[PDB]
Amino acid sequence: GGMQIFVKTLTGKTITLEVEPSDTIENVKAKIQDKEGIPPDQQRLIFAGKQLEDGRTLSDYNIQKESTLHLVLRLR
Amino acid sequence: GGMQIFVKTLTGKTITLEVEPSDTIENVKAKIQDKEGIPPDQQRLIFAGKQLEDGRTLSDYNIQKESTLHLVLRLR
Amino acid sequence: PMNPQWLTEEQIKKMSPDEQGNLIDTYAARKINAASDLTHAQLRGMIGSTAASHIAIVNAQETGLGHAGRYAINNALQQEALSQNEFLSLTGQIFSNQLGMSLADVKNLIQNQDDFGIDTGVLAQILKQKFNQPVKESKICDLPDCALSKQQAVENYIGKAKWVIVANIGTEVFDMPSSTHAVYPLTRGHFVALRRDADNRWWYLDSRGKNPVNIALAIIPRTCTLIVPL
């Protein structure tokens, strides 16, 4: 069971996340943290050319199965 | 009155459904849902060695009274 | 309570297994576009040991494959015991020999990744043929004496078995405890496994999760189907 999405960096690295349509962007960043050790404040997620906000869900953004999110880290 | 068919799992469990020849496979899956709590997307129905499609009727498949359909759940 | 948003992690940690399981069966189901009525922190109160364990998620969910039936077996046994090819061969043989499906139609079934999926009967037949391992199965809520105590009804049903496989058949997605940053819910139409260690601690293993998590048996949603090796 379950829905998968992809998260792709500019490095080219791509990872598969296990998600639900009801997942908030907050929980998605937490899943990236679990896999890669990157805290959410160092994550910028982009889909359809827009920066995603933490309180909205994948379904809110029309992110569906096998969609690709773009991850660019926020290093300052 | 009314026509009955059987739905048999690999577990061996067999149930009797109340149907009409005009029933779509969609409505048959809905009847299995009412009895067993299994949503249609978790149902695969097989008759005469073929997976049944939702938009066709029992009569379309030549499913007659006391025919046995095979149910295998789609768990992923 | 009536409103669970006041329960603290500490209160939940002091609860019995049956009290924790009641929170799961009452509040852990996600809504259609939102999480359940239990937070990550609250669910973390249901975790026992966070110490190092030799038990691991041997099989993670692979990209594009609905093969949790295989993953749960391998996680239950803590080995790469069932390969993909044998998983798919044994499955196809069932449709071929028992359901009269042609070779061409069986191959379509195996190869259509989005439409693929098996059930507890296929699982039992795989376990019997490949490993000579009989099983019994039951919904937790149908177990003898479950109404009196979910924890003990499940314990008594499992007996001395070292692993169990769990099928979430139905429409509900359950938030579950996780020893990590994210919530990893038990999604609908999906297999997971649990493995018992030497201290009789049970470790919950979702191929879609990050790490094993030590939870009481009563944490498993009561509508789920338990498969128990005999």
Q: Which residue has the tokens 């061409």?
A: C104
Total length of chain B? 76
Spatial separation of the C-alpha atoms in residues C211 and B56, rounded to whole Å: 44
Q: Which of C212, C213, C36, C206 is nearest to A23 (CA)?
A: C36
List phi, psi (to 5°) of C164: -145, 150
Tell me which chain C residue has its CA closest to the CA of residue B38: C170
Q: Do A34 and C210 touch (CB under 8 A)?
A: yes
- Going along chain A from its start, the domains and CATH numbers come out as 1-75 (3.10.20.90)
Helix axes C84-97, C103-111, angle to 10 degrees: 140
Going by the DSSP 8-state scheme, the letter that residue A24 receives in this structure is B
Angle at A15 between CA A14 and CA A17, to 5 degrees: 145
Look up residue B64 and give its two tokens. 């007659």
Q: Do B76 and C190 touch (CB under 8 A)?
A: yes
Q: What is the CATH number of the domain that holds C177?
A: 3.90.70
Instruction: List the resolution, Å.
Output: 2.2
Q: Which residue has the tokens 């029992």?
A: B58
Which one of C115, C119, C125 has the shortest CB-CB distance to B73? C119
* Residues paired with C195 in a beta bridge: C163, C203
Of chain A, the end-to-end C-alpha distance in Å amounts to 39
Which one of A1, A16, A27 has the shortest CB-CB distance to C187? A1
Neighbouring residues of C13: CB distance < 8 A, sequence distance ≥ 6:
C45, C46
Q: How far is CA A62 from CA A1, A66, A68, in A?
A: 20, 12, 12
Number of domains making up chain C: 1
Spatial separation of the C-alpha atoms in residues C86 and C217, rounded to whole Å: 31
Q: Residues C218, C20: contact at Cβ < 8 Å?
A: yes
Q: Which of C22, C12, C1 is nearest to C218 (CA)?
A: C22
Which one of C35, C180, C181 has the shortest CB-CB distance to A22? C35
Size of interface B-C (CB pairs under 8 A): 80
Q: List the A14-19 sheet strands across, edge first.
A: A14-19, A3-9, A68-73, A43-47, A50-51
Set of chain C residues whose Cβ sits within 8 Å of the Cβ of A4: 61, 63-64
Q: How far is CA C50 from CA C1, C45, C200, C201, in A?
A: 27, 12, 15, 11
Neighbours of chain A (3+ CB pairs under 8 A): B, C
Range of the structural domain that residue C188 is part of: 4-229
Set of chain B residues whose Cβ sits within 8 Å of the Cβ of A2: 76
Spatial separation of the C-alpha atoms in residues C184 and A69, rounded to whole Å: 19
Q: Which of C217, C73, C220 is nearest to C159 (CA)?
A: C217
Tell me which chain B residue has its CA closest to the CA of residue C68: B76
Which one of C122, C167, C170 has the shortest CB-CB distance to B72? C122
Spatial separation of the C-alpha atoms in residues C175 and C10, rounded to whole Å: 19
Q: Taking the C-alpha atoms of C221, C224, C225 and C229 in order, what is their torsion angle to the nearest 10 degrees?
A: -30
Q: Residues C19, C27: contact at Cβ < 8 Å?
A: no
Neighbouring residues of C161: CB distance < 8 A, sequence distance ≥ 6:
C196, C228, C229
User: Experimental method used, please?
Assistant: X-ray
Look up residue C131 and give its two tokens. 């490993």
Q: Is A30 exposed, middle or buried (0-12, 13-18, 19+ CB in 10 A)?
A: buried
Set of chain A residues whose Cβ sits within 8 Å of the Cβ of C224: none
Q: Which of B42, B34, B46, B30 is nearest to B73 (CA)?
A: B42
Q: Which of C140, C138, C189 is nearest to C168 (CA)?
A: C189
Look up residue C9 and give its two tokens. 């992690």
Q: Which residue has the tokens 């997620």?
A: A45
* Residues paired with B7 in a beta bridge: B15, B69
Q: Which of C182, C158, C91 is nearest to C130 (CA)?
A: C91
Q: Do C173 and A20 touch (CB under 8 A)?
A: yes
Q: Which of B55, B52, B70 is nearest to B10 (CA)?
A: B70
Going by the DSSP 8-state scheme, the letter that residue C34 receives in this structure is S
- Cβ–Cβ contacts within 10 Å for residue C147, how many? 9
Neighbouring residues of C149: CB distance < 8 A, sequence distance ≥ 6:
C18
Q: Which of C212, C216, C166, C211 is nearest to C189 (CA)?
A: C166
* Residues paired with A51 in a beta bridge: A46
Q: Which of C208, C173, C209, C207 is nearest to C188 (CA)?
A: C173
Size of interface A-B (CB pairs under 8 A): 3
**Is C32's Cβ below 8 Å from some Cβ in A?**
yes
Q: Taking the C-alpha atoms of A61, C189, C92 and A16 in order, what is their torsion angle to the nearest 10 degrees?
A: 40
